[PDB]
């Protein structure tokens, strides 16, 4: 799809067997989701944003489907105010910014 | 241009006669720049993201160039960790997300 930016670019994702709404975020290095369980090991991480830092759990090799498109990568889980799909997974679905 | 996301989408901007680096951010409603002087009156605004909220100064109808494309619009100034070009100005330069 071509998605305009008149409104927030939200899409449906499937992760951990759950459907969620997430923001396609070209200004995010990483993919950050609100609290949920994910299988496998994890390790703690601090990430920054406008606002400062939050502590998250880092899960590697997590499969996600973004608006129809399968990918695999690291997913961070923690107290984010918005679910975001960051560049680590946007690349895998071939997303580009065009102007 | 077409910008892939393997690296941060950093571009040069021109504001107040000076060149700066900024991040194209589809997850940002607004445009937020590090402390600088801008002409005219400002108004108060609070902006939130991962981390919490910060106070910023809102300047309207500021001339800004983004990767060479001319825009005129609202610029927020404050203690952001990074210069961010958000959807208010990405829509002015005709940017879309594509996959």
């Amino acid at each position: 799809p071509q998605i305009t930016l008149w409104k927030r670019p939200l899409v449906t994702i499937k992760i951990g067997g759950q459907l969620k709404e997430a923001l396609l975020d070209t200004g995010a290095d990483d993919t950050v989701i609100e609290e949920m369980s994910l299988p496998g090991r994890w390790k703690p991480k601090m990430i920054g944003g406008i606002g400062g830092f939050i502590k998250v759990r880092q899960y590697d090799q997590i499969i996600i489907e973004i608006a129809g498109h399968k990918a695999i990568g690291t997913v961070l889980v923690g107290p984010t105010p918005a679910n975001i799909i960051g560049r680590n997974l946007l690349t895998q679905i071939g997303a580009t910014l065009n102007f | 241009p077409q910008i892939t996301l393997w690296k941060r989408p950093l571009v040069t901007i021109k504001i107040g006669g000076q060149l700066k680096e900024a991040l194209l951010d589809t997850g940002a409603d607004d445009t937020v720049i590090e402390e600088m002087s801008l002409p005219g009156r400002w108004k108060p605004k609070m902006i939130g993201g991962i981390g919490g909220f910060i106070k910023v100064r809102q300047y309207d109808q500021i001339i800004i160039e983004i990767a060479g494309h001319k825009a005129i619009g609202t610029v927020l100034v404050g203690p952001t960790p990074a210069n961010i070009i958000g959807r208010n100005l990405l829509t002015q330069i005709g940017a879309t997300l594509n996959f």
Binding site: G27, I50, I84 | D25, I47, G49, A82
Partner: peptide
């Protein structure tokens, strides 16, 4: 030094 900028007006 993962940085992640969602942003909205509070």
């Amino acid at each position: 030094v993962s940085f992640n900028x969602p942003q909205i007006t509070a």
